[PDB]
């Protein structure tokens, strides 16, 4: 948790002597550093086959047109079995009980657009948690819950 941190826990140039106590009396926030890095620590020493293959097994490119689309409702599926063959005529003459299981899900209810990530669930947070602006500021903070 990123609470306030004293000056002597930040790798920066500090104050030595009575000037430290002068600084802590004049500066508005005594736990802020000057920002100059620590010369004594910061950058002190300078910098001086098939089992493991997947590209060849990339998912294939298969296109589903009106001809093949009609075949799933009539013949069924390759898991649960049941030229130009137009779909529009098939929808005009076919059993709605085929529709309520194949062409639709959960009793004809329309299929909500598939989420790119299901677990994107948000919750509204509060000031004492995220340490951000108080309530009057015109933003709100969301989290992943």
How many residues bind to other proteins according to rule CB under 8 A?
93
What is d(CA 21, CA 6) in angstroms, rounded to the nearest whole number? 14
> Residue 81: helix, strand or coil by DSSP?
strand
Of 18 and 96, CB closest to other proteins:
96
Instruction: Return the residue of 21, 24, 85, 105 that touches other proteins, per CB under 8 A.
Output: 105
* Binding residues among 110-129 for other proteins as defined by CB under 8 A: 110-118, 120-125
Does position 17 interact with other proteins (CB under 8 A)? The reply is no
* Binding residues among 53-72 for other proteins as defined by CB under 8 A: 53-66, 68-69, 71-72
Identify whether the C-beta of residue 68 lies closer than 8 Å to the C-beta of residue 86: no
Does position 141 interact with other proteins (CB under 8 A)? The reply is yes
Identify whether the C-beta of residue 108 lies closer than 8 Å to the C-beta of residue 90: no
Residue 68: left (phi > 0), alpha (psi -120 to 50), or beta? alpha
């Amino acid at each position: 948790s990123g609470g306030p941190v004293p000056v002597f826990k930040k790798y920066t140039t500090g104050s030595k002597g009575i000037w430290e106590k002068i600084r802590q009396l004049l500066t508005l926030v005594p736990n802020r550093s000057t920002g100059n890095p620590l010369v004594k620590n910061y950058r002190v020493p300078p910098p001086g086959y098939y089992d493991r293959d997947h590209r060849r097994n990339y998912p294939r490119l298969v296109a589903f047109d009106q001809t093949k689309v009609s075949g799933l409702l009539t013949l069924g599926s390759a898991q649960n079995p049941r030229q130009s063959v137009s779909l529009s005529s098939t929808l005009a003459t076919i059993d709605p009980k085929v529709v309520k299981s194949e062409l639709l899900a959960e009793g004809g209810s329309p299929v909500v657009a598939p989420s790119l990530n299901k677990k994107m669930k948000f919750r509204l947070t509060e000031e004492s948690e995220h340490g951000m602006y108080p309530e009057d500021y015109p933003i709100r903070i969301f989290a992943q819950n």
